[model samples]
Target: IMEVLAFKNQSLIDHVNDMVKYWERIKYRYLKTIKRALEALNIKLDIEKVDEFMKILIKLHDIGKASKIYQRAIINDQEKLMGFRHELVSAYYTYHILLKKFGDKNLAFIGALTVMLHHEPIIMELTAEVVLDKLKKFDGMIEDFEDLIKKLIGYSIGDINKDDIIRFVIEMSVRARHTPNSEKLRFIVGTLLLPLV
Candidate 1:
């Protein structure tokens, strides 16, 4: 099962259901594919710290879709969704959720950094200014990307150290971006956030 990080929409049952299933499928398959290798690398299923990080990142990475503006955009009910991007909110939550989920400061940093680079393509060498600019495009009027990243990751990063950020981004993006087909991806939702009820 997955956790809810934002207020959900009653009107979006199928939408929410699909997300749940897809998230479950990815987690299962990810562990399936790399089960043996991960044990050596420290992600020994549910027993290791990195396991939780991967689960949280994969499970709720897109939890930002529950946002009102994002809902409006998806359903086209209003103009409120303009310039809004779910990944932006997801990255913001990644840090919060990781921190809340795990007590380790270092682990939270790793998870959030991976989550940050999960949804977007890595461009040329990443600079704080450039990365911030890329994130800025996803902003709307209410919350800005710089502010969000700074708030979420500022203290952990020692004022935006680019080298560490770039290295982790490179390491985790591949792990974070494993794309499965829709059929298997649907399994991410699994049996019960009560959608089928």
Candidate 2:
């Protein structure tokens, strides 16, 4: 991948490749499952021509895992970093299709948010104590948990209910199933997908 060539570590590159393989192994089935849930709940995205966007989000959701920092702090640590971030890269840094299109920014935010909290389930008020407690799976040393959570959610969902946003994500992912698989060899070293939006 153009993203992987700039990386200095082979481990990171291999891990990303493995992650891609893992993603491909699961994405289709995952989309089907999400689609089933959405049909049961009668949820649908308001966006027109949404398949491509949904596919893009699902593909990029966990893209931050390609980082060496993450491979060290999370994956290589035996999954100790349970509350790890998965989207700061894909959300803010990447100026790709999501940002070039109008209205997709909101979708991008939601995609990033779902990728972020997929494992956490947002169990409390998201205060410093609660957040740090969750990330305690690793070092539990985040001093900016409160501000970080608030800022991201403020931008991602704003006044919308978090659960509703999550539901919409599931619906969109389901619709995204119609899209052709986009399993490219994508990467951007340490800085390519860092924070921007």
Candidate 3:
């Protein structure tokens, strides 16, 4: 039996397909503007690399919707929300995928942060306790997410380490508080990286 789960009007796979198609079609229009934005902020980014990274983001951005919790809710046509935000789960996978590809933790962090805040602003506190709890709650359904990702990307991604995630979160939290204007800059970066997905 085929298990076809819907995300919005289409299935999860189709949604990612449509997002990727739209991004590829419209990315050229925004690449130059994105470059100018990064230049104004004095952030040294290779636009070509950003282009590739955004492709990955667009495809994987909603992989979390494959989780049983989200599928059940959507299948029921219910809007009442529960559990962790889908973007967070998607970001978790995105971080690992980029880290493996780039071998750069900072770059991976930026990619993951962009996905995490794609739908919402940085008003929510990112604490280890909440993150760990939510991730654990949905951990069992990761296979569902992974299967779809493999189908979408034609490859398998690495697993995330809870310890590593906790460490990164704590470090970012400390630095975000200590570094003046870091939040504002981070928000700017996140907003800039959004691929209209």
State which candidate has the highest TM-score. Answer: 3
Question: How would you encode candidate 1's per-residue C-alpha lDDT over 83-135 as one tens digit per residue?
Answer: 44465455555665566656655455444644454543322034444444434
lDDT of each: 0.43, 0.37, 0.64
Per-candidate Cα RMSD to the true structure, in Å, reads: 10.5, 13.7, 3.8
List the pairs of residues colliding in candidate 2: 3-187, 3-188, 89-193, 92-196, 92-197, 93-196
lDDT of 3 by residue, 1-197 (tens): 23535554578777777787888788888776665655555545687976776777777667666666666666675643356566666676777887886677766666676666677654326676766655554533444555677888767764534455446555554544564656655755555555554
Off by over 4 Å in 3: 1-8, 36-45, 77-81, 121-124, 132-136, 142-144, 158-179
| TM-scores of all candidate predictions against the true structure | 0.44, 0.35, 0.74
The best-first sequence of candidates by lDDT reads 3, 1, 2
Q: lDDT per residue, candidate 2, 125-190, as tens digits? A: 334344334333332213433333243222321222223323433444443334342221011111
Superposed model 2: Cα runs more than 4 Å off = 1-48, 73-84, 87-97, 121-125, 128-197
Candidate 3, lDDT over the whole model: 0.64
Q: What number of clashing residue pairs does each candidate have, in the order they appear?
A: 11, 6, 0
- Model 3: weakest 10-residue lDDT segment is 134-143
**Predicted structure 3: clash tally:** 0
What shift in Å separates residue 59 of candidate 3 from its native position after superposition?
1.2
The C-alpha local distance difference test score for the whole of candidate 1 amounts to: 0.43
